[PDB]
């Protein structure tokens, strides 16, 4: 059961990976996980604030 994935390349090409162990802890790291969400740390406050309105009214 071979898996085909994209490679890390520049902008302005696939690598085959096969698991040979069943421990699942013997796999490679998940380097390609480019997801971010600053909503927790920034804009923590309950009532939402618009970009251009008086902050306190």
């Amino acid at each position: 059961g071979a898996q085909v994935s994209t490679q890390k390349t520049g902008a302005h090409i696939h690598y085959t990976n096969i698991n040979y162990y069943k421990d699942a802890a013997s796999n490679s790291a998940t380097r390609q996980d480019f997801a971010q969400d600053p909503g927790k740390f920034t804009e923590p406050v309950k009532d939402i604030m618009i970009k251009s309105l008086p902050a306190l009214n």
Binding site: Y21, D23, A25, S28, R31, D33, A35, P38, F41, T42
Partner: protein
């Protein structure tokens, strides 16, 4: 036995290598995961959060909480300069220890805009107007308010909202500017001036203070991760 050749570099150890190796314990049952608040997926998200700036980092002031405070007072003549600091976050003493600066000490290249936030901390009666300016590289640092106005600037008024944001546009020939100071790329000069004299009623203090907050903008990015300069050990700790 299939015939095989051995590549150069066989049996070598690379710090940054990604390979498959056999587990010490077979079929271990890992403890189940549970929901935890403030989950982190990217370092940049931590840098977006504002960090207090020790702008007055001179002498005894770093030892007290006076480092963060910037002094302001009513003055006879308008046009005096409140403060001046280097644009780059990584090398400059003023931004080196801040959240964004500490993350940058870890990475060799840095890119994108910086947001600076200024909050007046004086009495309600106190009023004033200040001019916050950024001057593009290759021009001597502004020595007068007229020179500073030529560089892009935001005029701020105290009262109503008590905080202002000066956003420094990225203006670099290169896509990436080195975190380490570089002769080739100079980030810029950031300076503040009195647009008008501070005015206060009798029984209100003449002199107030202004705190500064520094953060990465949405366009900001980093590359070439490297060991940080600040952390060192003479011996293993016990």
């Amino acid at each position: 036995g299939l015939p095989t050749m051995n590549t150069p570099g066989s049996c070598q150890f690379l710090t940054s290598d990604d390979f498959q190796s056999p587990s010490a314990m077979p079929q271990y049952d890992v403890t189940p995961e549970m929901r935890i608040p403030g989950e982190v997926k990217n370092l940049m998200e931590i840098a977006e959060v504002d960090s207090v700036v020790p702008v007055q980092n001179v002498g005894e002031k770093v030892n007290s909480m006076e480092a963060y405070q910037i002094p302001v007072r009513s003055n006879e003549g308008s046009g005096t300069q409140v403060f001046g600091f280097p644009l780059q976050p990584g090398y400059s003493s003023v931004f080196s220890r801040t959240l964004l600066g500490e993350i940058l000490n870890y990475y060799t290249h840095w890119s994108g805009s910086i947001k600076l936030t200024f909050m007046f901390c004086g009495s309600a009666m106190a009023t004033g107007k200040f001019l916050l300016a950024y001057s593009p590289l290759g021009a001597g640092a502004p020595t007068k308010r007229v020179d500073a106005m030529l560089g892009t600037h935001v005029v701020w008024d105290v009262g109503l909202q008590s905080s202002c944001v000066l956003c420094i546009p990225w203006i670099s020939q290169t896509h990436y500017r080195y975190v380490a100071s570089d002769e080739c790329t100079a980030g810029g000069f950031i300076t503040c001036w009195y647009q008008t004299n501070i005015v206060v009623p009798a029984d209100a203090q003449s002199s107030c203070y202004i705190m500064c907050f520094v953060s990465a903008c949405n366009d900001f990015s980093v590359r070439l991760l490297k060991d940080t300069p600040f952390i060192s050990q003479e011996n293993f700790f016990q």
